[PDB]
């Protein structure tokens, strides 16, 4: 089998470069157009995706550091990623996310219904492995282990999608962009047209390991037992578990901290969301003997006037989760360490992390005004994709027109159409929020737009 | 037959006026609302249609002057138009063009699919002969020869249209304004509802002359031999050939000069568009012995920092085409001089003029941002026409409501509908780009519009 430091394309380093291949991955990523676009992309609307990706990289390094010295896990030290690989994986995890976030993701998936759908994490793999113009046709040409580390869902769209969930009540009067977004969310997956990339990631493993590692589950009873739902992938690589843990800690605490600052989560919300289960903080305070973890003391410090009393509690909770990162084996039958080993929190810490994250989804993610803005990004992307798809040679830039022509060669009929719509999907998804707004305004908004 | 200085309506001049009828045409045109609208109408988006029409008038006068003294063409001096007639024809040629240019023209033709279509040059005749409020129902009431001079395409829409080219792949999800504009372009023609105007222009000629002069051709193989295409008219009057030559010289050189200034055409584009065929400049430089026509010398002067080195080359190329205007006979079997005689460039000069014009279409006319703005004018005009057509008495001004009522009298059924939609088409097409934008914003844009 192939090495983990192997790339799809041959790009050997000069003898002047003792940097390991994982550092070369970090260097290419930071100097890449896909990573620099994280500035003009916000996840909530304040906090940009670049800042979130840096905080996630910091948390992941702290996780890897904590594990690399805890001798209870000394048996697994050799399989931990290094500082450069965990950073590059953490800094790349939100690269594929489209403009306007979930509003744009639902939009592109709805437009690509007959052509493979769209999902952000799949586009992250698509950009990293092919789209980014660091190479001709191999993206940034990352190492096998880095590609595996960003593959959060190693199962294809077709193998996971349940198109019965897309079913809608007919409405002759509704425009094409007007629908319930929750019923058009894609499965978390990789795109079928990128199977070659996934083949490379998995050529360094035994095929029985691949079958066990790509196992899925059928979730049941989201509201009713017969409600149709997509299938979920079940397992991620070891490095991916570390990044996914850091990614959730930031969403649970750092987006919570921003919610306190903006006033979207009050102490009344806190004490009502924790009206029961004050032991989520208190019982932990007893076991670890940390008076700072007392529910009433940490509540006063979180909702304190002095900003140094809040950041001290946020950082205390950030440190509490990093110090409670355990590494177990997943219920996959895999014997490879990178496929069988998982990093996660202590069960009592995860209960507290989730319960803080649930208050964030309730007051921030599902705020009426936040959702109204997501729908507008849905309308904008749909209306932009339609127009770019109706006459792509009139509107698209010349290099994008070349890819669309190139994608259709050797293909005819419906396969040619899906391959060319994929290029348009990669063009729109690779837009920044302001670039997509300007592109919308040049095409539709009455008095806006300039030829330069 | 009738005189060339004859008008549809009787408007004789006072004895105090020794001005010839062609000067009276020039005077009425300049003081007309249709000609003054050329200020608020741009052709590219910089250079307005008024400025283009003045440069065309200057080139045409230079053409007529050059021919009126070249004794190789002395046999045809008596049939050349005078200074006033060639100016009025040149200043009127773009009067009918709608807001947003081709974007608005494709829009109106698409809306008028079942009602006669729309084309700019046809509206120029419609405004000049009927619409302009200089008279009651005869427009500016121009002379027969001036009307003939603006009749670039003396064949009707119905006689030229190939509705198979309008055929579209069905799309249930597309809004009414979303289509490929290239497949909805109208034929270059005059509108069927203006046949009476064309009858007057042609009552001063023998009917055999009319049949030969209105001959058409069926172009073949735009991309494939079986691609459906409209039919083209074949012949223009002598005065029209002079105006059409001046009109093309301005587009080929003056719009090229603006392209240099804005940076849309680089010296790299020039030397790559002329990578072969440097003899288009050089061979002419040999025959005429003009070292300024050397490809490398004129390239340095065109792309020079000093603006006096560029304008000296542009004006040299403007002068080179005027000095190479020849007058031949067209392959029409006509014996009337105004219908059989044509003015055009020398074959080697036309090869150079076209090749410069092709670089203008490639970098300017078909720039992605220029086309994106054209589509937005297409969407705006379509959405404006629809709403004005749904309830014309609620929205249209009282004088326009009078014409629409008046156009429907004596008619019922589908003929009444087409006659009233023609008035709405004349209202929208006669809008300036900013007037159409304000009219769009009052009706659709959320927070815009005032009752005054
Ligand atoms: Mg993230
Ligand atoms: Mg013109």
Tell whether A93 is in a known binding site.
yes
What's the rounded Cα separation, in Å, for the pair A122 and A138? 15
Residue numbers in A near B432 (CB within 8 A)? none
Q: What is the CA radius of gyration of chain B?
A: 23
Euclidean distance between the first and the last CA atom of chain A, given in angstroms as a whole number: 51
Residue numbers in A near B373 (CB within 8 A)? 442, 449, 451
DSSP three-state, residue A216: strand
DSSP three-state, residue A32: coil
Take residue B432 and report the two structure tokens written for it. 């300036």
HSE, CB side, 13 Å, CA atoms: give it for residue A1: 16
Task: Tell me which chain B residue has its CA closest to the CA of residue A400.
Answer: B368
**Alpha carbon of A394: minimum distance to chain B alpha carbons (Å):** 6
Instruction: Please give the backbone phi and psi of residue A312, each rounded to the nearest 5 degrees, phi first.
Output: -75, -30
Q: Do residues B189 and B122 make contact, with C-beta atoms less than 8 angstroms apart?
A: yes
Angle (deg, nearest 10), helices A279-287 and A347-360: 150
Pairing of strands B232-233, A232-233: unpaired
A210 Cβ contact partners less than 8 Å away, ≥ 6 residues apart: A202
Take residue A283 and report the two structure tokens written for it. 């019982």
Long-range pairs of A32-37 with CB within 8 A, sequence gap ≥ 24:
A32/A132, A32/A134, A32/A140, A33/A132, A33/A133, A34/A95, A34/A127, A34/A128, A34/A131, A34/A132, A34/A140, A34/A430, A35/A91, A35/A92, A35/A95, A37/A95, A37/A430, A37/A432
**Which residue in the block uniquely carries the two structure tokens 């049941």?**
A220
CA distance to A433, B361, B363, per residue, from B44 (Å)? 29, 11, 12
Instruction: Report the residue numbers after which chain A has a gap, meaning the C atom sits over 2.5 angstroms from the next written residue's N, or none.
Output: 45
* Residues paired with A344 in a beta bridge: A326
| Determination technique for this entry | X-ray
Instruction: Please give the backbone phi and psi of residue A251, each rounded to the nearest 5 degrees, phi first.
Output: -60, -35
What's the rounded Cα separation, in Å, for the pair A232 and A235? 9
Q: Do residues A154 and A232 make contact, with C-beta atoms less than 8 angstroms apart?
A: no
Residue numbers in B near A445 (CB within 8 A)? 376
What's the rounded Cα separation, in Å, for the pair B90 and B150? 8
A315 Cβ contact partners less than 8 Å away, ≥ 6 residues apart: none
Task: Tell me which chain B residue has its CA closest to the CA of residue A110.
Answer: B173
Q: What is the CA radius of gyration of chain A?
A: 23
Take residue B253 and report the two structure tokens written for it. 């050189």
Residues of chain B contacting A, Cβ within 8 Å:
45, 171, 173-175, 178-182, 262, 367-373, 375-376, 379-380, 437, 440-441, 444-445
Q: Do residues B5 and B145 make contact, with C-beta atoms less than 8 angstroms apart?
A: yes
Q: Do residues B313 and B322 make contact, with C-beta atoms less than 8 angstroms apart?
A: no
Angle subtended at Cα B357 by Cα B351 and Cα B359, rounded to the nearest 5 degrees: 110
What's the rounded Cα separation, in Å, for the pair B333 and B336? 9
What's the rounded Cα separation, in Å, for the pair B417 and A214? 64
What's the rounded Cα separation, in Å, for the pair B449 and B452? 9
Taking the alpha carbons of A426, A430, A436, A442 in that order, is the dihedral positive or negative? negative
Residue B278 burial class via C-beta count within 10 angstroms: exposed 0-12, middle 13-18, buried 19 and up? middle
Spell out where B83-137 has E strands.
none
Q: Which ligand is nearest to the CA of A53?
A: 1
Q: Do residues B357 and B258 make contact, with C-beta atoms less than 8 angstroms apart?
A: no
Q: Which ligand is nearest to the CA of A56?
A: 1
Residue numbers in A near B368 (CB within 8 A)? 394-398
* Residues paired with A342 in a beta bridge: A328
* Residues paired with B217 in a beta bridge: B232
What's the rounded Cα separation, in Å, for the pair A28 and A19? 12
Residues of chain A contacting B, Cβ within 8 Å:
175-176, 386-387, 390-391, 394-398, 439, 442-447, 449-452
Flag if A386 and B45 touch (Cβ within 8 Å). no
**Alpha carbon of A303: minimum distance to chain B alpha carbons (Å):** 40
What's the rounded Cα separation, in Å, for the pair A256 and A248? 11
* Span from the CA of B301 to the centroid of ligand 2 (angstroms): 27
Nearest-CB residue to A451 (from B367, B379, B445): B367
Q: Do residues A41 and A437 make contact, with C-beta atoms less than 8 angstroms apart?
A: no
The DSSP string of A84-116 is HHHHHHHHHTTSSPPTTTHHHHHHHHHHTTTTT
What's the rounded Cα separation, in Å, for the pair B263 and A15? 44
What's the rounded Cα separation, in Å, for the pair B27 and B21? 10
Instruction: Report the residue numbers after which chain B has a gap, meaning the C atom sits over 2.5 angstroms from the next written residue's N, or none.
Output: 45
What's the rounded Cα separation, in Å, for the pair B389 and B376? 20
Instruction: Please give the backbone phi and psi of residue A279, each rounded to the nearest 5 degrees, phi first.
Output: -70, -15
Instruction: Please give the backbone phi and psi of residue B169, each rounded to the nearest 5 degrees, phi first.
Output: -65, 130
DSSP 8-state assignment for residue B190: B
Q: Do residues B400 and B427 make contact, with C-beta atoms less than 8 angstroms apart?
A: yes
The DSSP string of B133-184 is TTSSSSTT--BHHHHHHH-S--SBHHHH--TTTT-----TTS-TT-S-GGGG
Mutate to test the interface with A, among B262, B375, B379 (most CBs of A within 10 A): B375
Nearest-CB residue to B174 (from A386, A442, A443): A386
Q: Do residues B408 and B419 make contact, with C-beta atoms less than 8 angstroms apart?
A: yes
B424 Cβ contact partners less than 8 Å away, ≥ 6 residues apart: B385, B388, B389, B392, B396, B404
Please give the distance of CA B248 from its chain centroid, rounded to a whole number: 10
**Which residue in the block uniquely carries the two structure tokens 């493979």?**
A116
**Alpha carbon of A443: minimum distance to chain B alpha carbons (Å):** 5
Residue numbers in A near B171 (CB within 8 A)? 390
Residue numbers in A near B180 (CB within 8 A)? 390-391, 394
DSSP three-state, residue A143: strand
* Span from the CA of A49 to the centroid of ligand 1 (angstroms): 7
Take residue A22 and report the two structure tokens written for it. 């994982």
Single out the residue of B189, B183, B188, B150 nearest to residue B169, CA to CA.
B183
Take residue A341 and report the two structure tokens written for it. 């080993």
């Amino acid at each position: 089998m192939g090495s983990l430091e192997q790339r799809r394309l041959e790009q050997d380093k000069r003898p002047d470069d003792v940097r390991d291949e994982y550092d070369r991955d970090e260097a290419r990523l930071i100097h890449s157009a896909a990573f620099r676009r994280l500035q003009s992309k916000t996840q909530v609307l304040y906090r940009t995706r670049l800042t979130h990706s840096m905080e996630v990289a910091q948390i992941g390094r702290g996780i890897v550091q904590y594990l690399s010295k805890n001798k209870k896990f000394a048996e697994y030290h050799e399989h931990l990623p290094n500082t450069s690989l965990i950073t590059a994986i953490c800094l790349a995890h939100d690269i594929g996310h489209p403009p306007f976030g979930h509003g744009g993701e639902v939009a592109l998936n709805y437009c690509m219904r007959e052509h493979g759908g769209f999902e952000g994490n799949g586009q992250t793999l698509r950009i990293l492995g092919k789209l980014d113009k660091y190479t001709g046709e191999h993206g940034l040409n990352p190492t096998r282990r880095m590609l595996l580390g960003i593959l959060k869902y190693p199962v294809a769209y077709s193998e996971l999608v349940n198109e019965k969930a897309y079913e809608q009540v007919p409405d002759k009067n509704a425009p094409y962009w007007l629908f319930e977004a929750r019923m058009q969310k894609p499965p978390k997956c990789y795109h079928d047209c990128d199977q070659e990339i996934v083949d490379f990631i998995f050529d360094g493993f035994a095929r029985e390991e691949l079958a066990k590692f790509t196992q899925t589950e059928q979730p049941i009873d989201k509201d009713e037992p017969e409600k149709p739902l997509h299938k979920k992938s079940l397992y991620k690589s070891l490095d991916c578990t570390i990044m996914n843990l850091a990614d959730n800690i930031s969403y649970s605490l750092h987006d919570f901290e921003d919610a306190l600052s903006l006033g979207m989560i009050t102490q009344r919300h806190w004490r009502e969301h924790f009206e029961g289960k004050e032991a989520l903080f208190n019982d932990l305070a007893k076991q670890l003997v940390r008076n700072d973890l007392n529910f009433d003391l940490i509540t006063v410090n979180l909702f304190h006037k002095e900003s140094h009393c809040r950041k001290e509690a946020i950082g205390s909770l950030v440190n509490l989760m990093i110090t409670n990162a355990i590494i177990e084996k997943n219920q996959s039958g895999c014997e490879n360490p990178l496929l069988s080993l998982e990093v996660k929190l202590a069960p009592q810490i995860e209960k507290l992390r989730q319960h803080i994250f649930d208050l964030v989804c309730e007051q921030v993610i599902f705020d009426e005004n936040v959702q109204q803005l997501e729908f507008k990004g849905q309308k904008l992307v749909i209306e932009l994709f339609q127009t770019l798809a109706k006459d792509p040679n009139r509107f698209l830039p010349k290099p994008t027109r070349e890819r669309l022509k190139k994608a259709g060669e050797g293909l005819e009929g419906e396969h040619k159409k899906s391959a060319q719509l994929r290029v348009i999907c990669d063009f729109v998804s690779g837009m920044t929020d302001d670039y997509a707004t300007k592109f919308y305004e040049k095409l539709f908004t009455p008095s806006k737009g300039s030829i330069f």
